[PDB]
């Protein structure tokens, strides 16, 4: 289960570089130079790295400082063969964004948020990024009167439409991916789930430029089924990027390494991504727990990739097993994939077998055989076949 760059595993600078500060704790690790992170990740078999503007260039840097930060980072990529498939903007850390970036009540802040974003889009394109993520972590409210949500969505659409106009004007090939989260740091965050983000995209001027960047932990913070949400995103042709990690149910955003948290959901996620032929980066947005030293940081990062590869093997074995294939037919997964009424509306209305002469009791008596199918899945996952 050794990863290589061909596996497309990527990591945010802010992941392995997390110093361990939490709402009740000071840092437990020294800051990492992005150059060292790129080197260590490459050694582990990563394909690339991602960044917020402010991860790569400290906020408030002069043009000369900016140039040097980028130069060193560029050299690290060149030294290792690492890529930068995605980048994003920090519109959440600085106190100016305390009520949001794109949907701040203050109009001057909204305009600044757009300019900060546009600056980093140019840099992302320079470094070769194909996807530009937007996580509106500060868009939302703690109280009901503070944020008129219809007005906020008007502002959010205005912002994304302007970004689309910008990339079009420059002839950039980059596309946007909106990252939903239901809460934290705001009491409620706007576009809280994959569904809300997908719906919002449909109202944009150029919807083809926008997809979703769902995160395992985020959908799980709403108690939702992450593989189901990913399936709906795939169904809509909008899974532009994905963030992999672990989460134990409904609580603060844990950002455990992938495989941790809900292990079976991780299995079903990998099964879906591989079956569907998802071809984007397998990106980890995780935090090595603050209990760890740097050796533990790299161990945790390695574990992300290892767990993906183990689950990949087991899911493939599951789908390829003739006994499982038989069980899938027994449970009528084949029938689920057949149209309900390709014969058309009038034919359905005229079909007595669909109502007048439908034996409901006989149909009801037919077991779904889902438990046997699921125990085959369990046996494959655990290597107990």
């Amino acid at each position: 289960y050794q990863p290589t760059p061909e596996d497309r595993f990527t990591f945010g600078l802010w992941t392995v570089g997390w110093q361990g500060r939490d709402p009740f704790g000071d840092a437990t690790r020294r800051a990492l130079d992005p150059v060292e992170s790129v080197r260590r990740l490459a050694e582990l078999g990563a394909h690339g790295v991602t960044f917020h503007d402010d991860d790569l260039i400290p906020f408030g840097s002069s043009d000369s400082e900016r140039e040097e930060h980028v130069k060193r980072f560029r050299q690290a990529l060149d030294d290792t063969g690492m890529k930068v498939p995605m980048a994003t903007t920090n519109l959440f850390t600085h106190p100016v964004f305390k009520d949001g970036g794109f949907t701040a009540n203050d109009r001057d802040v909204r305009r600044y948020a757009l300019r900060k974003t546009i600056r980093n889009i140019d840099l992302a394109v320079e470094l070769g990024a194909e996807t530009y993520v937007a996580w509106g972590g500060r868009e939302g409210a703690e109280s009901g009167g503070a944020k008129d949500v219809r007005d906020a969505l008007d502002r959010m659409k205005e912002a994304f439409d302007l970004l689309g106009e910008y990339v079009t004007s420059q002839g950039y090939d980059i596309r946007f991916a909106i990252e939903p989260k239901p809460n934290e740091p705001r009491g409620d965050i706007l576009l809280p789930t994959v569904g809300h983000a997908l719906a919002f995209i449909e109202r944009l001027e150029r919807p083809e430029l926008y997809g979703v960047n769902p995160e395992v932990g985020h959908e799980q913070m709403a108690g939702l089924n992450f593989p189901h949400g990913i399936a709906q995103a795939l169904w809509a042709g909008k899974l532009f990027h994905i963030d992999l990690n672990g989460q134990n149910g409904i609580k603060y955003d844990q950002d455990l390494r992938f495989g941790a948290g809900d292990l079976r959901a991780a299995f079903w996620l990998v099964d879906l991504l591989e079956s569907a032929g998802y071809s984007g980066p397998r990106h980890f947005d995780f935090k090595p727990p603050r209990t760890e030293d740097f050796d533990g940081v790299w161990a945790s990062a390695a574990g992300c990739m290892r767990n993906y590869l183990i689950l990949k093997e087991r899911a493939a074995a599951f789908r390829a097993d003739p006994e499982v294939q038989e069980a899938l037919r027994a449970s009528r997964l084949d029938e689920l994939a057949r149209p309900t009424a390709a014969d058309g509306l009038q034919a359905l209305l005229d079909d007595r077998s669909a109502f007048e002469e439908f034996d409901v009791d006989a149909a009801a008596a037919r077991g779904m055989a889902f438990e046997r199918l699921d125990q085959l899945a369990m046996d494959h996952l655990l290597g107990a076949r």
Copy 2:
């Protein structure tokens, strides 16, 4: 706070008619004749009632029995002046729907589900319903291999497209409203939130025919902010109907009377519906707790309406209070409603006040004054002004 039919309050037959059976309990009340429910609800000041096919006509009824059930119900409506603004299909109770209706793995069940629905659409139109609700409570899974979600969404779209073709073919004016729920009775239900339902509608052949019917308790079962979800539905022009009740957070679907559960969320919901000019029914999908006798049933129903009217008064007082209006300006809710960049992209790029000469520290130092605004809201709600 006395309701009258002008207030548009409606109730499902299955609400006040709930006999009190739960997953661990037998019935605590006798069944109600729909005729008596219509009379008692009218006496309380309700505007109308809604029904599943199987609430009004016992499953398996002959044509003669069906005719008599409808005749008696029609007479009750005529005797009281009650309306029927919405109807729906029961695609969840009968064991044949154990794996779903529209997305059952068994194709014969999917076809039957469509025929059962179509039959009741005709009846709904006959009784004057303007909205036809679909709650896919059995669409989903307890285990990962049982349901391929992309295939299931293909089947779900096929079903809704056929229903749209049907209403179009008959020249009916009725529109559809999809009701999301995240779980229960299935381990995970497809289209689990308002966002997922909105997104799905965009992929239908005739999206203009479909909106959402969100329920307070359902979105709260995912820990989501219900007023926020309703705002996004309104923003999309898709709030075709709404179900009002109460829920205490993340647990089984409680169906408490409206006002119970999250009281402040109820306040903000009423504030939003009234401000936006929502003009549809104020429908209660609640269950008087099984502790209650029939006197308690009608008391609980009356309380639904009373709480709506109290909250309406307090929200209106809040919005009309000059002190609140001043606080809203102090918190820049006015600025939130102004376009970010009506001057356009190039103007924004050329505007030094948006970046090069933006004083981020001065902006950051400006308090939002949200706590004072929220305490004014609290004071209005509690009648402590």
Copy 3:
């Protein structure tokens, strides 16, 4: 991974006998004769069965009917070698218990609840049960004024004290196990967690007679860590019995087969029970999903036992692996088991190495190595060593 009676696996009659009725659904399976359940479970390698009074003897049975039900059940036990290690009372199904049994507001209902319980204690002893479970599923409230909780706890203590007096008076060896659940069917249930039950027991007249019967799904409905709660119960010497199943986080009580739901929590639970030498029944309180026919029922039951045995193997391998033993020392699990201050208070106060000369920075810099340890655990669980 074939179970035999030596493994002490037991099942409730109401588990495999669940007909599939849920809050939105009619039965999907015919009722099972307890005699057939005993036979089928024995064939699968079960050790025994458990019952509520009303599972074994239909409510309202005459003395002659009662005698025959017991006679047939006795014969099934004798035919199979099955045991009955635990029994319990149904104080939740009948509408008389709509506000509770032991803590019903109506005093006559409380007295009846006690008499019903006492009758079944006699039967449980006759059939050889060593543990008598009490799940107060109806003890609680949907609204704040309905239940004064201090008064309710007074009544709950009165009830349990009387039961203790009863078993003492008869010279029975049977002990009680209180089963916590946080909610469902009541909006909030009294003694909602293992902790609350443990605390309550300390106020009983004869606390030695009472322990807990925790259920995996129940603690998980509060988002709690089930292995942690079981550890506290063991620490207190109060794990008299346990109910095993699966649950996907915070929602309605799913009662999935053991191993389903939170797989890693199942692993850590088995690790703890085996390490601690828990010697009681491994009891499954689960429901085969209503999608299943009878073949699926027995498959689901078999899966409960299979998953326990797989996890047992993997946990044992984990603890026995010299590499894991080294990692445990690296993470100072050995130090966690050593007293903090066996030298005593004055020695600690006088020890400059504990404060005045404690190098906090050096201590802080020492990584815990928890991620490497956890990936070894993951590798063992998945059979990827």
Copy 4:
């Protein structure tokens, strides 16, 4: 609704002094001098303040610096008439406590945690504190193998027993209050609820010295009913202190001002504290949201007290209303307070009215009238009587 010191409202230095740092955000406010906080709080009508050691004396202070910090604080108390009824230790911020204080795997850290605590107990006594709180926020784990919970509870008991021995040895009158929280910052925290803490106390050497300090938001993070937990604490005679705030269900610890979050739970809490005659401080552990400037900080603090006083008035009016008193009798709250079987076990066994001649159907048919009672409560809360 103007608070005065007689109302016993207290605030932590770290509450109004929170600079607004969160897991995704830098500070939005400057640090407050404890002297200014004491003055501003007194002006608002507070009774007193509380502190962690490190809130009052910056970590690493020399003896001379320590003396001056205390001197200035003492002068502020004297200038205002403010009291210090409670103090606590910071065993969570410094990286040395990354795996805990009292239950750190490293024994040297456990010993240091005890010495740090003991030092501050002396200071707390000097400043007049009657209660010493312990919140073990770092006691717990993110992964299963990292923490053997039985061993950890052994260490936790050792620590609390030593603290008890210490206060006894000094003749101090101060008592301890253990503050539960289910998670955050650790993935799972030990003693996660009021119940677990109560149970743990019973195993201490001198249980009379220890009670609980429950927090509204903390119990709600497990989805539990806070008034119910407070009732069990009162029932056990262990409510030594309480922390008041607001929380919107199951998510990160929000620390909203009291009254925010679950408003009806706040009502029922105040009703219980006032009815029971809780005589300790009404302490607020809240954070003014980081959106706020200093004016908003004091507004938020004032709102805590205002909401307590409004709810106090409404709860008192509810209990005093003859119509409510009649409704309480109708719902048999009086019967709930009467012993079930003061006649004794044998009398109950011999009482045919308790079983043989108990009319279960007649009892079952009696409605509880809980909905009418609850709407009276709603009407009182909203000032709609």
